[PDB]
Design a protein around this nucleic acid. Sequence first.
RNA 1: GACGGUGGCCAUGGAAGUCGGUAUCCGCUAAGGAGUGUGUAACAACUCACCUGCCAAAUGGACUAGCCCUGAAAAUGGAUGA
Lengths: 205, 101, 102, 188, 166, 153, 52
Amino acid sequence: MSGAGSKRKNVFIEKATKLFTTYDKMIVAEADFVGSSQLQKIRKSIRGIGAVLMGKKTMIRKVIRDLADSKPELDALNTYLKQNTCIIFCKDNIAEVKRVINTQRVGAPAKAGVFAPNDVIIPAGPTGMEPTQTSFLQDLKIATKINRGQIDIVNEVHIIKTGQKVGASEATLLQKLNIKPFTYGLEPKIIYDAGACYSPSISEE
Amino acid sequence: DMFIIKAVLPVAESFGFADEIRKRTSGLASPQLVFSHWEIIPSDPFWVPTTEEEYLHFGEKADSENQARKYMNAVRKRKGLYVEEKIVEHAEKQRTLSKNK
Amino acid sequence: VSTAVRICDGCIIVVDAVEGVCPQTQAVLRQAWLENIRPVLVINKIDRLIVELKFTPQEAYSHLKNILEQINALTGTLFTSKVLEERAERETESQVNPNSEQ
Amino acid sequence: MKVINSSRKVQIPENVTVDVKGRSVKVTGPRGTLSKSFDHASVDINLVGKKELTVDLWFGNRKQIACIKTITSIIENMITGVTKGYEYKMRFVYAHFPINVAVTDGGRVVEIRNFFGEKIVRRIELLDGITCYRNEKAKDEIVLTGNSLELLSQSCATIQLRSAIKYKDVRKFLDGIYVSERNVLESN
Amino acid sequence: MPPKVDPSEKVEVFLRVCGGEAGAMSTLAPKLGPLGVSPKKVGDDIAKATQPWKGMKVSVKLTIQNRIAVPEVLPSASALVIKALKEPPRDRKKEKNIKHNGNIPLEEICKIAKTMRFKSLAVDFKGSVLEILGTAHSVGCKVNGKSPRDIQAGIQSGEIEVVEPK
Amino acid sequence: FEATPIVRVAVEPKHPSEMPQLVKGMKLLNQADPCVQILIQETGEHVLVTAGEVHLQRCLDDLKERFAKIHISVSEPIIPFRETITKPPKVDMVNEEIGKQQKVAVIHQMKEDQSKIPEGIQVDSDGLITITTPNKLATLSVRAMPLPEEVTQ
Amino acid sequence: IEPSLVILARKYKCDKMICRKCYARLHPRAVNCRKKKCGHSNNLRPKKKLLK
RNA sequence: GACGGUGGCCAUGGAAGUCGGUAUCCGCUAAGGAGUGUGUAACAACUCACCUGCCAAAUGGACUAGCCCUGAAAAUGGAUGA
């Protein structure tokens, strides 16, 4: 084929001329690796402050929308764009913009080849019984899955916790588990006012 | 322990149907045969398709050789009362009778 | 089958504990409730569940309940079905309290 | 009509000694050494220093160009393999009529015994240099390691070919020994 | 709607439509056979309760379990709320019959139900509902300015109001 | 006990000289396996009958073994169904009807379906329901309407 | 275990497509016979499973 | 990444994009057909259209027409004359 993704462009020309950069605060956010199903529910105060906007073909064309403002073109001698990264325009204060996305956040399920931190409890419900499942749970510390009047092969409380994070060893034991609600929020690429740039943050500073 | 469907099934199209599935799979297919009443379906079984011009206009095929005529093909003759049909009439000739009917 | 059932003065219900209650038997029996017979219940093929396929006797009990329920339904077509329920609720007439069985 | 062919360069890591006596390679690394023959198509093939071999030929056609690309690719694999040994794991599939797979460790010969009813002894001598070993993964799998990727793979294929049913349906049996984990290496 | 009583003794949520008043269907194991853990429906007339005058046909139901209890809950669906206001002839004896009939105003009743469908999409519950409902159905036109699943009306190509509440 | 649909089958002699044997055999069967129409006929010389569709087949096995050493050939163009008249015309003497000048059949028209077109579709193509036979010594009209299902039952 | 193996087997058995001329099996995403007897048909049908 | 309304209305009382009939809309987004198959009781799950991350300069296609190939099989041993 021959095009852009796999078809020629007629709406990505409009992403540069989508708005004027009237808003004084922007931030590069990594909300693409988290899924679109959960991404639309957390964003209610996230849109109305400037919205989640702009394409990633036009992220290089973004430079003509910084010359209008007092902002320099690059953020801190680098645009910081080597990832699925989108711009979120904000009207919230200099301290509030540091935690604008993390105020309402949620993660996606853990994939093959990565563990990810699991802070929230795992779901429950009737899923039969399996004796071979107990042999795989011997690697883990808790070897008990049947709880209460119901019967099932996974617990109602998270056994996978922070501290057990690794590259690729205990990640195979999560494929034995039948459900993956791995919460680690969303990820700031950088924080930025209108001239000065900062590192990713969760606090007011 | 059982799961139930109450699906209708014509009496003619089962001719050792319940016997096959029962033996093939006992327990996971136990058909209990229970009558109810005769369902009426939109189809008109009749001998010989008359005039194909009509058909060419097209609103299904009926009063002809059909899915419905499978049941009414040649069930008349179980040896039968006659070879096919023997009947005599005196309703013919409208002029001699002098009728408008 | 129907013809057979009304000739014979007695009866006996053979139902499977690994294949459920037989539908054929049920169908004919319902006609046979209009005739005077003495059908004794005997639940068969627990030899399949307990020994041959080899499942634990805890499961057997569980299985049996379903069978019993099925039988209750059968009973309830043209005969009464409340004594059975009562029995299920509390086994036999005497010994009403579990503490007293000690 | 007749077009010049670009050189295809390849970096060589410092683990190994690619020598090239008259357009014909030998690549000596940790796992041992692999030689190979080239100058099929009259190509030129040079060393710049000792971290860069480059193949080329400065006139020709699509046909020649393709060949150039091929040779380089082939050598890259060899380089990879003679430094880090290759692993082609073949898993076998039967437990209705159970399967008996055996391995002569000395001569490096797999011997497949009983599958699809057979009482025969099917012995397949592995190609030069490569080896095998029995591995307990899930009461399954023969792992075939070797440094010549071309040869090992070929051997595996041969085995696969030999462990199937040459008369009647190809799906009545899906059984036999087939490749499972391939393009696999090691550093342990 | 959210659940009326929260599932206790581990969470239990099951999904079969249970359409119409008639029938004694209940959801405990739609992906497996009949039994889940134990027999517990609860009640055969739950369908009726859920769908008295909301539909005889493709009527969705969020079945749940509170360890041997069901409090009757529906999703406030895009089909169920519009068909609630429709006349009893098209809500009764249409179980084995097609229905593509209903062009009356349903403007008021869907506004309150818009929060129950979704609670966070960054849109107006009385403004964006005139686009999302009304011009997305063949059994519900609302005002006759809109068009049933078309590109003639609902997106302001004939309408004048579209994001504003009517 | 006979069947509810009245399931029949064309029992025939394989050989012509074996006809008598066949005839005899049915009677014999009657005592052992209950109910066959060997005598007192609604359709044909003789037909085998049973309590159902599945049992019809079974009883034909029995009419080969034993008895008068009988052997049969069979002709089953499946089990017979029945018809219903839910639409008369508006032509000649019929008071209660649902005929018009566009709906001729229950679905579509008789013209669009095909066949059975003696007269036009604008007065229904189901007409000529009154007749005369012996020069007005036995004139009659007839009306076939749907009988209620409960009543039928 | 078994099912995974079965899939693998299929991949080296069923998946390959054939040419309506030889009936010779090329591979599961093919566009040609790549044989000179066919005449290089490029008119392939997939191989029919035990389901069909 | 491949969504919300949404399980679209129907058939169903299971068919929840995908046994299947007809309409085939709107939100929101970087993008996402009331859905391309695989799969499943139908779903779920997976993939496709659709988009984007990286790598980094060409890509895609429908045809025409030279030579070649396929089409292109037959009778002593054989013919660009060798």
